[PDB]
Amino acid sequence: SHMLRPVETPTREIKKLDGLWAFSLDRENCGIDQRWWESALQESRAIAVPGSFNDQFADADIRNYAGNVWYQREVFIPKGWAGQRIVLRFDAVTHYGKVWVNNQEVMEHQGGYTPFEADVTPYVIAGKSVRITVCVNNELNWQTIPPGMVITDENGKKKQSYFHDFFNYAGIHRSVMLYTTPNTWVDDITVVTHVAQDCNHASVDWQVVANGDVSVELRDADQQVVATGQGTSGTLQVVNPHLWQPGEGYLYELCVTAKSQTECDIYPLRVGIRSVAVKGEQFLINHKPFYFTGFGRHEDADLRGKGFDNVLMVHDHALMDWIGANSYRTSHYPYAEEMLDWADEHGIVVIDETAAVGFNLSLGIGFNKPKELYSEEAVNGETQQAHLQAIKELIARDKNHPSVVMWSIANEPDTRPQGAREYFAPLAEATRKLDPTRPITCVNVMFCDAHTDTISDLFDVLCLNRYYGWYVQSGDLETAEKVLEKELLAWQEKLHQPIIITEYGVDTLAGLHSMYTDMWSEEYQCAWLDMYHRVFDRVSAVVGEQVWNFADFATSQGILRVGGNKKGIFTRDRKPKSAAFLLQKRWTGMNFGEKPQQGG
Amino acid sequence: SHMLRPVETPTREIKKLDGLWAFSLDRENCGIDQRWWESALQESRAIAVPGSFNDQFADADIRNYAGNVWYQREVFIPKGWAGQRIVLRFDAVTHYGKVWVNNQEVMEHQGGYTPFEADVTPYVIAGKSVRITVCVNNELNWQTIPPGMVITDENGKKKQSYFHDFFNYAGIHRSVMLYTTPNTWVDDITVVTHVAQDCNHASVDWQVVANGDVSVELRDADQQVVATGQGTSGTLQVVNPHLWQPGEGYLYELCVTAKSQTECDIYPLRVGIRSVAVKGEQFLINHKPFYFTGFGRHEDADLRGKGFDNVLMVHDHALMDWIGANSYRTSHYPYAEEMLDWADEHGIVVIDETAAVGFNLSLGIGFANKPKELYSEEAVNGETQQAHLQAIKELIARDKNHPSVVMWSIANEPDTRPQGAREYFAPLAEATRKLDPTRPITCVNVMFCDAHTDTISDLFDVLCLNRYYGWYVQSGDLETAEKVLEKELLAWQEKLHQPIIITEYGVDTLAGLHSMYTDMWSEEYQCAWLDMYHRVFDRVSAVVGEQVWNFADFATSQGILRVGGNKKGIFTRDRKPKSAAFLLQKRWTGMNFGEKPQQGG
Numbered sequence A: 001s002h003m004l005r006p007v008e009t010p011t012r013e014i015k016k017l018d019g020l021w022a023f024s025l026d027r028e029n030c031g032i033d034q035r036w037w038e039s040a041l042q043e044s045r046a047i048a049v050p051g052s053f054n055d056q057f058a059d060a061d062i063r064n065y066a067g068n069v070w071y072q073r074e075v076f077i078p079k080g081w082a083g084q085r086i087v088l089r090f091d092a093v094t095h096y097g098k099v100w101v102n103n104q105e106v107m108e109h110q111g112g113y114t115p116f117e118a119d120v121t122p123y124v125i126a127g128k129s130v131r132i133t134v135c136v137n138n139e140l141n142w143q144t145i146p147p148g149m150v151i152t153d154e155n156g157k158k159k160q161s162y163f164h165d166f167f168n169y170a171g172i173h174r175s176v177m178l179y180t181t182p183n184t185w186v187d188d189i190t191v192v193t194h195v196a197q198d199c200n201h202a203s204v205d206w207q208v209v210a211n212g213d214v215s216v217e218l219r220d221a222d223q224q225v226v227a228t229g230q231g232t233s234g235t236l237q238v239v240n241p242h243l244w245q246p247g248e249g250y251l252y253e254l255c256v257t258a259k260s261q262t263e264c265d266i267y268p269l270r271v272g273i274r275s276v277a278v279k280g281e282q283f284l285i286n287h288k289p290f291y292f293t294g295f296g297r298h299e300d301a302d303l304r305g306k307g308f309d310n311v312l313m314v315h316d317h318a319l320m321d322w323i324g325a326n327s328y329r330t331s332h333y334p335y336a337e338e339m340l341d342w343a344d345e346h347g348i349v350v351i352d353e354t355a356a357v358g359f360n361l362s363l364g365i366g367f368n369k370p371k372e373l374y375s376e377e378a379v380n381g382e383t384q385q386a387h388l389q390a391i392k393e394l395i396a397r398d399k400n401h402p403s404v405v406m407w408s409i410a411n412e413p414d415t416r417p418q419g420a421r422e423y424f425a426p427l428a429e430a431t432r433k434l435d436p437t438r439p440i441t442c443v444n445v446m447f448c449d450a451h452t453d454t455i456s457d458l459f460d461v462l463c464l465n466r467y468y469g470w471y472v473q474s475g476d477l478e479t480a481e482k483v484l485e486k487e488l489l490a491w492q493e494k495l496h497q498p499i500i501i502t503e504y505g506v507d508t509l510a511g512l513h514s515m516y517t518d519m520w521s522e523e524y525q526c527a528w529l530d531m532y533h534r535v536f537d538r539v540s541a542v543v544g545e546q547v548w549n550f551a552d553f554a555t556s557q558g559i560l561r562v563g564g565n566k567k568g569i570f571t572r573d574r575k576p577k578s579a580a581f582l583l584q585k586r587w588t589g590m591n592f593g594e595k596p597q598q599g600g
Numbered sequence B: 001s002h003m004l005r006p007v008e009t010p011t012r013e014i015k016k017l018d019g020l021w022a023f024s025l026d027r028e029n030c031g032i033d034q035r036w037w038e039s040a041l042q043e044s045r046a047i048a049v050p051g052s053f054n055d056q057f058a059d060a061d062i063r064n065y066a067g068n069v070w071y072q073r074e075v076f077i078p079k080g081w082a083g084q085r086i087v088l089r090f091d092a093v094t095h096y097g098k099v100w101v102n103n104q105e106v107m108e109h110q111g112g113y114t115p116f117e118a119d120v121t122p123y124v125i126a127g128k129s130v131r132i133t134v135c136v137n138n139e140l141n142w143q144t145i146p147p148g149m150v151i152t153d154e155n156g157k158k159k160q161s162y163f164h165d166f167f168n169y170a171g172i173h174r175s176v177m178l179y180t181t182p183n184t185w186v187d188d189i190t191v192v193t194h195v196a197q198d199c200n201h202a203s204v205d206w207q208v209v210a211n212g213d214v215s216v217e218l219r220d221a222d223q224q225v226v227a228t229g230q231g232t233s234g235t236l237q238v239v240n241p242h243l244w245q246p247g248e249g250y251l252y253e254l255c256v257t258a259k260s261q262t263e264c265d266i267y268p269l270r271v272g273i274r275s276v277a278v279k280g281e282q283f284l285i286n287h288k289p290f291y292f293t294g295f296g297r298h299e300d301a302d303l304r305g306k307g308f309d310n311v312l313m314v315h316d317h318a319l320m321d322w323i324g325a326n327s328y329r330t331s332h333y334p335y336a337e338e339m340l341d342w343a344d345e346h347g348i349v350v351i352d353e354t355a356a357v358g359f360n361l362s363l364g365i366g367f368a369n370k371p372k373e374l375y376s377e378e379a380v381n382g383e384t385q386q387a388h389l390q391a392i393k394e395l396i397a398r399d400k401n402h403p404s405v406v407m408w409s410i411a412n413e414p415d416t417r418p419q420g421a422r423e424y425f426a427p428l429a430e431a432t433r434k435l436d437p438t439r440p441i442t443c444v445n446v447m448f449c450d451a452h453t454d455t456i457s458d459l460f461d462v463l464c465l466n467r468y469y470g471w472y473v474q475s476g477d478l479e480t481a482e483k484v485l486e487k488e489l490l491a492w493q494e495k496l497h498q499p500i501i502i503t504e505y506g507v508d509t510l511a512g513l514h515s516m517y518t519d520m521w522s523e524e525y526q527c528a529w530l531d532m533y534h535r536v537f538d539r540v541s542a543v544v545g546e547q548v549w550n551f552a553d554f555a556t557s558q559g560i561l562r563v564g565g566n567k568k569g570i571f572t573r574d575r576k577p578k579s580a581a582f583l584l585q586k587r588w589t590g591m592n593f594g595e596k597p598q599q600g601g
């Protein structure tokens, strides 16, 4: 499905984020039978969108709810819309959403972190008010991405269990909008930017227009047109270019025009001219070895859950700018597109990841599970199909973002059973055909080591999650150092791939200080991080370090029973722990994007 | 002036809350001279609106900045807006704002918590993009509401000093919006709803139209038309009505139409049919004695400052619904209008207050160069009074139709001991009564200006007493405080025979601090401190309200934080409950709704 992000000019957007919506629980699952979308929601209350519904109400019974919830709101179509193509779009409805315009079912979606839209022109009269009803479901099963399993007790009460660390927040987490286009419109764009030794060259264009003739022009930051092209595709611009570089992120504007006999459509696409490639043990941006610094993150904050917020990304970005982070990873689900836009504009490198986390029954944090992970009753052929679909929707959404340099199709799957490689090999090869321009990865769980892991050879970059090393090493630092280094070297011998440690750190209660440098203390977090740093600087194959996590986040419970939820460098209200200043000195102390010399 | 809150009707709005604006500091104050609005802001950064600019960037040098900041943003004007009147509106720009469309200066405003808008039709071309630049100033002087004084040191670096407890957050704190109307449009509406022993009547209106004929229709919640009328202002409608009551807040819809016969304009106004009146020592809503419970609040949250936010509004209301608060006060400044909208719909009682706080030089928290005469040319003067009156004007005209607002508070804790005091406030008190006779009026009293020394309280209808800091003067002793408090309350009862609301009480409490000794800063002491007030309240007939200070921990100025008083909340800043939250809940849900406990408690 083609998706382009809405921008304004021959097109227009009316944001429906005006938060307050009618909101209801459907504890008896009678909402569909009684067609709640036909009238006003009964016994509803005010809720804010975007935002998770879970923490908005200080109510535990709502927070831990599993099943269907209902959103509802009336909105006016502008008068001036008539004659235009009118689209209703949800940037994200977490897990499942079904939408009604008045009484007409218009769209449906499974997948909680990517947009979905439908042409609603025949069901609205511009200038009138229309009722919009959304049925949102938060249940996970073996075919959802991520997977989980629902447990219904004797009384028929549902309770959600799952296998990832973060809390299962749900609701309309991101922007809802109506947007307009001419009946002739640009429906899809794909751009590839080749570079050759940085004095030269090119921007390849493939464009799909639902119904028009295509012209294309490229302007710089000064708006000087620097190249032009004709045709639905084949376009191969010619440039002596300002390259999209980490830390700067120069952007061109690719204006795409689509001409009918009577109508024209103009679409501006931000373009960053840069190359990404793996060469041996190195990751190359613009044919230069890059060293990642930064975080695994989460979409998590007080009150709003995974709900999107402008003040929050402004603040968070000022923080990882200050600390010297040049990169991050969209940990365990696709993020709101605004972060990617931010990264594009500010030259921030991003590892884009699917919501495929929890394909693992051996994590061991917890208290009726299938014994075969890859089997009909668990991860099956439909799961693989859902997994592939999740990869499609992520790539189709983010293929043009210069900030995205790699695709992560999963996080910490158990790769020890035999059916593992049969599951992932097709996904890995489908991913390469959906987007050949970017290296591919699958984030490795630690107990699936170099000796036991079966799938990593299918990918381009080795991303290692090392977080719970403090558990297995019982907190001993010098056993941890020698164990860490020999495992990293073993991975370097098995694969000869560039290595990024995408998770490392330890749970740290802010304000706990110790003279013994022991667990949960701020001092231990510093010493624990510092040992990873010393080892990284002695291993040539390591090209990246991303700390887990940026800030304390709410966890499943689940993880909170080990407690469990203090993994951040910052607190949830974004206050720095002492380790924040340790990272700042290391990350601002090195030459930008340059691995430190052997060793340090 | 003419302010009506935008609704979609014949009128359309494009929110400019698409938060990311261009943002820059102006430390050399060259922005106006180099005419920054003509081009794109140089060396700017992304900022979010609505929101304070202070805490968005983790930067102290930006947080403590005093002077001009610049906002800038490009936006497309809708295609179907051609032929329409196009207005550019800011719900609030905190303290001062000046706005440019492209190169055309279109508006200017002083006052940080009330809307201002301008017809920009001749300066925009529909279907094209226009550059919008806002110069925002956060400086306070003796003529601003609230007042303060700016100090320029050795090096010429500005530094802001002021007299209120909360931090001087600034920026575009609330919604920005372009909206449209037909060239014939409803420009103002005023509604007064009379009630008489609650079985019947009445609704008087007044509508100002720039240029059209007026029809008026009133529909109930079922959308049944229940009354109609004609004329620009003649309506005095007749109903056997469902009255707006605390805890429910039934609302009617008054549809106002303005007709040319090439153009028509329709405006829906929510109307709550209720009466508010003082009679002796009682506060009457719909001729029924009402008892206030709840909080003094603040517009304060992590990261965003005083920036407005829907999730936070939903959560806080879930909390003070749960806790049994039936009311609150817009402490020390006008709040965003959405809150009043919430209160109207949910039947929540509100004391609406101006930003006139800090008219006092004797509070004594902080370290130094202050005028000796509070009411004089060098301090609070005649121009200050004019700004003060202007602030009252803008508040009332914005909130005159909100049924949740049951009284106006024109000031908070002014020093009334100096010589110019009664001369300053008496005109303001009477000007306000002329602006809206329908609502009782008040001025929140500082404790040191007691019954013997206060000179202005007789000029008002309801006595609002701030008793926070009782713990300070009483050295934390509970039963001396209990004895002092009861007598001061009785002293006020004999001097004035006004109904008494305690609008501030509580004590600074470090969340998570527990003590076997029930000492200061501990949660156990806070519960014990609050309870002593409750016992005294239940012994005084004149007390008709208790509002705790404060709802949640909020950021304070350095002076207050040097004594470290930013822990005044019942809840923390991230909205976690202290043990007192559960004490108030049991008391407030335990009493009959809106009913003062019987004598004894």
Ligand SMILES: Cc1cc(C)c2[nH]c(=O)c(CN(CCO)C(=S)Nc3ccc(O)cc3)cc2c1
Pocket (backbone or CB within 6 Å): A165, A362, A363, A364, A365, A366, A412, A445, A446, A447, A468, A469, A471, A472, A562
């Ligand atoms: C903090 C903690 C607590 C408990 C109760 C655990 N039990 C386990 O089986 C395991 C298994 N294990 C050790 C490998 O030999 C790991 S590293 N489990 C793991 C858990 C969550 C992840 O995201 C990754 C790995 C770890 C563990 C950790």
Ligand SMILES: Cc1cc(C)c2[nH]c(=O)c(CN(CCO)C(=S)Nc3ccc(O)cc3)cc2c1
Pocket (backbone or CB within 6 Å): B165, B362, B363, B364, B365, B366, B413, B446, B447, B448, B468, B469, B470, B472, B473, B563
């Ligand atoms: C917690 C605290 C701390 C300090 C350093 C003080 N100095 C005072 O002179 C005063 C003056 N005072 C006692 C005479 O009744 C009061 S009540 N001052 C006051 C301060 C702020 C207000 O919002 C209200 C009153 C109080 C005070 C309180």
